[PDB]
Design a protein around this nucleic acid. Structure first.
Ligand code: MG
Ligand code: ZN
Ligand code: ZN
Lengths: 115, 148, 82, 99, 50, 67, 49, 258, 186, 186, 496
RNA sequence: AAAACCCAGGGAACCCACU
């Protein structure tokens, strides 16, 4: 009856921005990254990578409600370093790491299949 | 430079009346020369302390040797030279009670300072000449370091 | 009774404030002129609360004494509870 | 239960000797003593299990039962005997007989 | 709020305490009026609190 | 009624194991031996056959209404 | 009539369903279903705002 | 900051499951890989069922549910198929769907088992997985029959559990809890893990404060819809694609802000 | 399909509606791939004293690992908790059925050891779609111009006498008038 | 209208249920040795409430017929099995003695409300409010009494892997968190 | 128009007993077909989600919408008028988790703190300095809760397991067990938060937060506690199991020894009564005296066994974790689960002789022993014998009968009370008059003070000695040095 | 025949559930 369909966990609608950047005003060099139609399966990794930057002072993520598919990543970096460039560096680092893991897994499969 | 107290203590008893918490235990320690008692809660897991150990304890208002009097925010990127590098165990907490053996007529001789480090308490019972730098509801550090 | 014999409590108690807010938001929603400079709002209840903090509600409240008499307190004359 | 006869006995404190019955006190100690006695008794049953209720509510119930001179029992026999209004008395359990 | 540090001697005149309390008791009004009947009611209303 | 297709917890394909499970049971095997002979290590997958009731055969005794 | 109709009576604009706990919303917030919200109406006055 | 270099060491590779170790990576990365195994790996599953006729004792929606949960061999077609909602076709086509047809009538006194073998596809590659016996869909008494045409479409685990290729994904790090993330009240009672390396005298490894989660152990057991290694490959590819799309959206948002 | 609000109950008086439904990846999991189907409140045990529920869970683990349908006759004296624990220990599990559960979101293993195992849950008739109903100026009774009774006839809720008393206590006279006159039978 | 129950008959300090009775009763449908044959054998008899006031009735033979510090040593009847004091709905409770009696009463009340295959020929019956389940299962943890209630042939409920864990906060007040994938699997 | 987010509704549960049984809430739209409400609202409603269904009313007019928003919002009735204490409190799962969270030995790595701070709505964005800087940056759980506590409030409470002799000797300000709750300047100094700190008890932390701060601030305080503690509970985790119900073999031997000693004690009392060697207590018959002795021995056995059982919890048993936090259960609950159920009672006494001088046909006639009369020596873990199981059913049936009959008789009561006083109000002259303007009280509650903004206080003038009263209050101005220490010298000479 | 079905005009008794 009120059961929502299956596809809103990942599908966006017209007028729905996938990512929304809101600059925080409480502390300098802080922004809120609102990711729509997503869950922990990206936010946890983004938080973990942003913890590896030694110039990031705050980086966390939360879901406002498990029934609403959206997450907010709050990123606070040191002054002279934008949080947005921290985010885009973390994304590139994850892409590089996953790609590297990919060819290494290919090599492992090849090593296993012919001994 | 910003140091409120400094003395060498010696561990005499570790949580003698029982072991209440697995990760933190209290140490009943006596001063080497100043003849004062100190009871300190310490994280055993990250800094194990055995009975009979001897350590230096330097209560300081700030880590920065210039006495810049930082507000107390977490700044891991500050590269200014702090005094924490000379030590190996920094506990940061607030002093909340300074009671002492005082009379309505004369001054107090034996003072007792109570400081809580988040949840870790420390009572320093000493003489008024050594605890004079402590102020109620003031901002301090711990800075201990064991030595042979 | 004149202002010399004005014996009720000077504080606007919670029932009076609750009814004043409702009856003022109802007026504002029905295209009544706004007493205070709004910074842009659509909900008339928020406008009424803003007027309450500004103490500019054009309402005089009639407090009925139990004997039959009544006092007339101005909203700006009443001390707001909050 | 018998006051006004036990209190007459020798070696018996006539000041602190209380009672459990409410009607008996009203015959002996009047109406205002009942308002105190009912307060203490009602407080006793409420606070017996360790629960707490503010004294404002205790005072009002004890006073509304004694604001008529006699014991106003909370039934149709006591509520519907005071001049409150036909609608008030018919709003209670007995409706047609009042109207 | 005011960072007393009660080890140091205080700096308020005790006569201010007595006068402040008496003035405060006048400001706490349950029953208005000035006739002695209202004065007794006001005294009895805040007898325990005063 | 009928055997579930997948483990509720796992999703392990169990619907094809029921006939072999019965064949092993009538083959004088203990049901515990039958379960790990069929290759069910997780007990959540084992309960799908250990606690299943095959009511479909009771449902098949009645003649079909529509023919 | 007095009790069953005058004192306590059936009222429009009311909903009744089972409650489920939820810790992700404030104490003054209640999570109502869409269908109840799509059947329960509030009379809003037309203003230029 | 930068990303560390992870490494893979495969302990075993079987047609059912794959067991391997990922070292020198964060805990969140490993957990995300597990979650993508469970959900984000796309496969082919039956989603559109048209019951032309039915006379079985099981009702129609029951048959459709049982058909949807049947695994399908999609080792290479799922990478070619477009999503049904994303295809520009006339609401169905072989480029975003796979046709299945079932037509079975029981014309004998024996109970005829409508198994997964009765599902006839038009694409020879996309077939039911079932050495092992076939998947029993429904039994039929004499005179009963069921005819249906089923379309299978690409989907992943978030959409529904019938698009879940993994039977079971075992995940554990630090089998001797040197990090002491969990605290055994009495560690003597606890049996050791498969990857534990302590002598039977010792219960748990000594605590180290400077340690971090690493050397993650995987055991990905496939349900048969995909090979256990292509599950991992497609999972990594999909996670990388999601990150790439997120970066593209981030770049659009940044250039809009500037 | 079971949705949230559907009333589920064990065989021990441990009833309860479905609070929420997470997917498999969000549900916690053991060292193996086993994720729980139902996650119940630990607080329902200590006051209700459904120790039989815990014993049923342990016996279910033992039965599923052993491969036999366990016996749970009340007065047996041949099957106690100690024997069940000893039997479970033989299958590579903890003595008392606790197991190291890993978090489904962060992946960090839970500090506590979650008691897990198979029980027998039963679904009750009291589902939420049969009980949910709302109304706005629906059908009106003919004897008096008041709303109907029961959701089958699109009836409205009754603002009974205690509700009127509570709204008097709140002092919300205007709301009480609205409910009893404007929203019921003007 | 009198209410009676069958009970074992105890001689001097011995049961009249000898081993030969069990041997003849195991081979039913062959010897045609039924319960009525045992009743006519003078081994068991029906005792009503009136006669219970004048009978010394033992729990079990293994305890109250062996010489000890004598309690009575004058038993007349012996209970066949203590578990038979329960009703039809209370007999499906695993380990009912380990629970609290209000919980057992609540389970017996809810046991009548659990949905499942209520009858085998439900497809013919035009019953109103018919609730049946897709995949009912026999309980892994069962009692010996279920073999006679035929609960293992028409069960109501599914064995489920439950975990008793405080969690995100939806299993808070007698509520349960379910698995979306499991539900999607029926 | 269809209701949207932010709309005001009235949300009540039958039976509506008190005025917190009917609250005003703000509408939030969520997909599924149930009323999702918050947790702390359960206690005023007494709705335990066990199939409970709720009623929701919508104020149609705009004027009545403001009437509810200014009167019936849940922040405005956190404190009850009936007992001047909060009614919202903290639900069990948050309470147990926060009790474990606020322990002294709780430490959090940067990431977990960095995650938890995101759920604080009232966070200014400044990460507090860790309690442990070296070797590793490590925050104490009390620091995180200090961020939760709003403004600057000061309270002193005692933990549930605070020893009564601790405040007597030393360590009264440095508690070895961390069992002294001290909140200072809006910061949690030290102590473990049980139900006596965050519950509905008067003078608790939430009650003081309501009074010192406003009411919206306390609303954020409740929401912040629930969100962050549940999120930390994911990392921590809380469960319950059979390992939480099994004591070591030494305790079981102690339990059996106590029962055997008590059982033999009753038997030797019984043989004293049979030989007329028992003497009757002055005030009752020899039967009632005999029943008193049997009840005393069994009650002592239940207490001693319960006390001995509750001394072997190993501080990790979840039963103790729930009872100590006071969230759910009691010391009796642990004792009956582990050690002994105890004596079963019907109508306040032992099991009556339903048959001819025997409770069951299984006991010999005139058997006044523990087992024969309803005492259960087994625990819920060991299981009850069939004679004990039936006797346990005896007690439970009495409980349900009480529950089923109490509703009708009690329910008639409040209707009489309300209808008797449905028109008693406070007029604008601060007097209390009924519908017919008859004054009931000259001032409400004889003082004119509402029942919400009052607190329990201690009168220092009462109960000193005469010399103690003079020593503590006279302000002796004759002493020089005392004046020098207390006042500044200009003020000292002014007084002198 | 605005066939604006702008969408019931039945009541009573009993039983069964849930709080
Ligand atoms: Mg309920
Ligand atoms: Zn499985
Ligand atoms: Zn297409």
């Amino acid at each position: 009856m009120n059961a929502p369909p299956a596809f809103e966990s990942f599908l966006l609608f017209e007028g729905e921005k996938k990512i929304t950047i809101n600059k925080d005003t409480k502390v300098p060099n802080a922004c809120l990254f609102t990711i729509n139609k997503e869950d922990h399966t990206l936010g946890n990794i983004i938080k973990s990578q942003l913890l590896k930057d030694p110039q990031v002072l705050f980086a966390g993520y939360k879901v406002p409600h498990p029934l609403e598919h959206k997450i907010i990543i709050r990123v606070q970096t040191t002054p002279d370093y934008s949080p947005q460039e921290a985010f885009t560096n973390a994304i590139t680092d994850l892409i590089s790491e996953l790609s590297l893991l990919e060819e290494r897994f290919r090599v492992a499969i090849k090593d296993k299949q012919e001994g | 430079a910003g140091i409120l107290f400094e003395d060498i203590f010696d561990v005499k008893d570790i949580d003698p009346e029982g072991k209440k918490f697995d990760r933190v235990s209290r140490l009943h320690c006596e001063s080497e020369s100043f003849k004062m008692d100190l009871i300190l809660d310490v994280n055993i897991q990250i800094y194990p302390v055995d009975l009979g150990d001897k350590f230096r304890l330097v209560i300081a208002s700030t880590l920065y040797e210039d006495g810049t009097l930082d507000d107390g925010e977490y700044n891991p990127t500050d590269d200014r030279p702090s005094r924490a590098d000379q030590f190996e165990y920094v506990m940061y907490g607030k002093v909340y009670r300074i009671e002492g053996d005082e009379t309505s007529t004369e001054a107090a001789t034996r003072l007792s300072a109570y400081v809580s480090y988040g949840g870790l308490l420390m009572r320093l019972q000493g003489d008024a000449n050594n605890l004079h730098g402590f102020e109620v509801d003031s901002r301090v550090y711990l800075l201990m370091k064991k030595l042979a | 009774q004149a202002n010399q014999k004005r014996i009720t409590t000077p504080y606007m108690t919670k029932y009076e404030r609750a009814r004043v807010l409702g009856t003022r938001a109802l007026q504002i929603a029905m295209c009544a002129p706004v007493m205070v400079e709004l910074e842009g709002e659509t909900d008339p209840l928020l406008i009424a609360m803003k007027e309450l903090k500004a103490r500019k509600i054009p309402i005089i409240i009639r407090r009925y004494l139990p004997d039959g008499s009544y006092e007339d307190w101005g909203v700006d004359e009443l001390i707001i509870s909050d | 239960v018998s006051l006004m006869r036990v209190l007459s006995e020798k070696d018996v404190d006539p000041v602190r000797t209380t009672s459990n019955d409410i009607v008996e006190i009203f015959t002996v100690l009047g109406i205002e003593a009942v308002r105190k006695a009912l307060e203490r008794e009602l407080y006793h049953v409420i606070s017996f299990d360790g629960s707490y209720v503010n004294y404002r509510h205790l005072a009002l119930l004890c006073d509304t039962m004694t604001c008529r001179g006699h014991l106003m029992a909370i039934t149709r026999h006591g509520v519907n005997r005071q001049d409150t209004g036909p609608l008030m008395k018919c709003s209670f359990e007995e409706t047609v007989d009042v109207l | 709020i005011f960072h007393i540090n009660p080890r140091l001697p205080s700096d308020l005149h005790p006569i201010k305490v007595v006068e402040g309390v008496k003035e405060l008791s006048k400001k706490l009004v349950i029953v208005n009026g000035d006739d002695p009947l209202s004065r007794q009611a006001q005294e009895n209303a805040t007898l325990l609190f005063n | 009624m009928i055997i579930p297709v997948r483990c509720f917890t796992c999703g392990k394909i169990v619907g094809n194991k029921w006939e072999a499970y019965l064949g092993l049971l009538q083959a004088e095997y203990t049901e515990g031996d039958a379960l790990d002979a069929l290759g069910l290590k997780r007990y959540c997958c084992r309960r799908m056959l250990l606690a299943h009731v095959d009511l479909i055969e009771k449902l098949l005794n009645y003649a079909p209404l529509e023919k | 009539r007095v009790r069953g109709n005058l004192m306590g009576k059936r009222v429009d604009f009311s909903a009744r369903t089972v409650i489920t706990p939820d810790p992700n919303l404030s104490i003054d917030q209640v999570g109502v279903p869409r269908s109840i919200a799509a059947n329960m109406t509030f009379a809003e006055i037309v203003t230029p705002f | 900051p930068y990303a560390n270099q992870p490494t893979v060491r495969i302990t075993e590779l079987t047609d059912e499951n794959v067991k391997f170790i990922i070292e020198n990576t964060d805990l969140a990365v490993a957990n995300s890989i597990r979650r993508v195994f469970i959900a984000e790996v796309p496969i082919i599953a039956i989603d559109w069922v048209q019951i032309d006729a039915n006379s079985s004792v099981l009702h129609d929606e029951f048959i459709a549910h049982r058909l949807g949960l049947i695994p399908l061999t999609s080792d290479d077609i799922v990478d070619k198929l477009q999503y049904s909602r994303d295809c520009t076709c006339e609401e169905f086509c072989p480029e975003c769907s796979v046709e299945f047809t079932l037509d079975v009538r029981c014309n004998e006194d024996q109970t005829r088992h409508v198994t997964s073998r009765d599902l006839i596809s038009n694409s020879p590659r996309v077939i039911p997985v079932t050495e092992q016996d076939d998947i029993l869909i429904v039994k039929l008494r004499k005179g009963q029959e069921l005819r249906l045409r089923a379309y299978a479409k690409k989907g992943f685990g978030k959409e529904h559990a019938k698009w879940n290729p993994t039977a079971g994904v075992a995940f554990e790090y630090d089998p001797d809890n040197a990090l002491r993330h969990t605290v055994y009240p009495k560690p003597e009672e606890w049996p050791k893990s498969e990857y534990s390396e302590l002598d039977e005298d010792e219960s748990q490894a000594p605590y180290d404060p400077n340690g971090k989660p690493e050397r993650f152990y995987y055991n990905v057991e496939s349900c048969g819809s995909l090979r256990p290694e292509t599950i991992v490959l497609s999972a990594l590819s999909g996670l990388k694609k999601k990150l790439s799309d997120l970066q593209t959206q981030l770049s659009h948002e940044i250039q809009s802000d500037v | 399909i079971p949705q949230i609000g559907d009333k589920f109950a064990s065989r021990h008086g441990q009833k309860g509606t479905c609070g929420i439904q997470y997917r498999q990846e969000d549900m916690p999991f053991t060292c193996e791939g086993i994720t729980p189907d139902i996650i119940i409140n630990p607080h329902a045990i200590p006051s209700r004293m459904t120790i039989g529920h815990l014993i049923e869970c342990l016996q279910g683990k033992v039965s599923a690992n052993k491969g036999e349908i366990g016996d749970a006759t009340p007065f047996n004296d041949a099957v106690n908790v100690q024997k069940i624990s000893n039997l479970l220990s033989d299958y590579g599990y903890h003595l008392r059925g606790n197991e190291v559960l890993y978090n489904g979101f962060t992946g960090r293993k839970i500090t506590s050891q979650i008691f897990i195992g198979p029980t027998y849950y039963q679904r009750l008739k009291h589902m939420v779609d049969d009980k949910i109903h709302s109304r706005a100026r629906g059908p009106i009774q003919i004897l008096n111009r008041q709303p109907m009774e029961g959701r089958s006839r699109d009836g409205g809720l009754r603002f009974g006498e205690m509700e009127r008393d509570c709204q008097i206590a709140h002092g919300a006279a205007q709301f009480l008038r609205e409910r009893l006159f404007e929203a019921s039978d003007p | 209208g009198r209410i009676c129950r069958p009970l074992l008959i105890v001689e001097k300090q011995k049961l009249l249920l000898k081993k030969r009775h069990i041997d003849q009763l195991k081979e039913r449908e062959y010897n045609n040795y039924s319960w009525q044959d045992l009743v006519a054998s003078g081994v068991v008899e029906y005792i009503d409430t009136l006669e219970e006031e004048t009978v010394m009735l033992a729990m079990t033979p293994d305890d109250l017929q062996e010489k000890e510090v004598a309690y009575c040593s004058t038993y007349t009847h012996c209970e066949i099995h203590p578990s038979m004091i329960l009703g039809v709905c209370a007999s499906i409770i695993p380990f009912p003695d380990h629970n609290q009696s209000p919980r057992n009463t609540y389970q017996s009340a809810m046991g009548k409300q659990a949905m499942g295959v209520y009858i085998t020929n439900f497809h013919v019956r035009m019953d109103t409010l018919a609730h049946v389940l897709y995949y009912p299962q026999k309980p892994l943890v069962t009692t010996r009494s279920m073999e006679y209630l035929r609960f293992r042939e028409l069960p109501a409920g599914i064995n489920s892997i439950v975990a008793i864990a405080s969690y995100t906060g939806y299993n808070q007040e007698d509520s349960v968190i379910m698995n979306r994938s499991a539900v999607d699997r029926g | 128009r269809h209701m949207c987010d932010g709309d005001i509704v009235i949300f009540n549960r039958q039976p509506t007993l008190h005025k917190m049984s009917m609250m005003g809430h703000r509408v939030r739209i969520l997909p599924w077909s149930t009323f999702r409400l918050n947790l702390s609202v359960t206690t005023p409603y007494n709705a335990d989600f066990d199939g409970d269904e709720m009623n929701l009313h919508l104020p149609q007019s705009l004027e009545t919408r403001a009437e509810i928003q200014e009167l019936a919002m849940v922040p405005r009735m956190i404190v009850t008028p009936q007992s001047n204490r909060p009614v919202m409190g903290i639900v069990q799962d948050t309470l147990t988790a926060v009790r474990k969270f606020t322990k002294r030995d709780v430490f959090l790595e940067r990431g977990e703190v960095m995650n938890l701070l995101m759920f604080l709505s009232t966070w200014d964005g400044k990460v507090p300095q860790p309690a442990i800087l070296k070797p590793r940056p490590l925050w104490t759980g009390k620091q995180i809760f200090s961020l939760i506590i709003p403004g600057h409030i000061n309270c002193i409470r005692t933990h549930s397991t605070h020893p009564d002799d601790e405040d007597s000797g030393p360590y009264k300000h440095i508690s070895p067990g961390d069992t002294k709750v001290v909140v200072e300047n809006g910061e949690l100094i030290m102590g473990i938060l049980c139900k006596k700190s965050l519950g509905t008890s008067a003078g608790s932390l939430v009650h003081i937060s309501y009074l010192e701060m406003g009411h919206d601030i306390t609303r954020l305080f409740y929401s912040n506690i629930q969100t962050v503690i549940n999120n930390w509970l994911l990392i921590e985790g809380h469960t319950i199991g059979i390992g939480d119900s099994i004591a070591d073999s030494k305790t079981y031997q102690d339990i059996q020894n106590t029962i055997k000693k008590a059982k033999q004690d009753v038997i030797e009392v019984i043989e004293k009564a049979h030989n007329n060697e028992l003497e009757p207590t002055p005030g009752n018959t020899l039967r009632q005296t005999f029943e008193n002795q049997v009840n005393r021995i069994l009650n002592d056995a239940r207490d001693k066994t319960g006390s001995s059982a509750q001394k072997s919890l190993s501080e990790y048993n979840n039963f103790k974790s729930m009872v100590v936090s006071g969230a759910k259960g009691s010391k009796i609950n642990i004792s009956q689960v582990i050690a002994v159920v105890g004596q079963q009672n019907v109508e306040g006494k032992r099991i009556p002789f339903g048959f001819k001088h025997r409770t069951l046909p299984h006991f010999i006639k005139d058997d006044y022993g523990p087992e024969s009369r309803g005492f259960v020596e087994n625990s819920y873990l060991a299981g009850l014998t069939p004679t004990e199981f039936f006797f346990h059913a005896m007690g439970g049936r009495e409980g349900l009968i009480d529950t089923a009959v109490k509703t009708a008789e009690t329910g008639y009561i409040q209707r009489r009370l309300i209808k008797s006083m449905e028109s008693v109000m406070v007029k604008y002259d601060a007097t209390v008059r009924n519908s017919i303007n008859q004054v009931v009280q000259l001032r409400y509650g004889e003082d004119g003070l509402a029942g919400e903004s009052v607190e329990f206080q201690n009168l220092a003038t009462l109960k000193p000695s005469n010399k103690a009263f003079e020593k503590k209050f006279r302000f002796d101005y004759t002493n020089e040095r005392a004046l020098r220490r207390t006042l500044q010298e200009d003020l000292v000479k002014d007084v002198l």
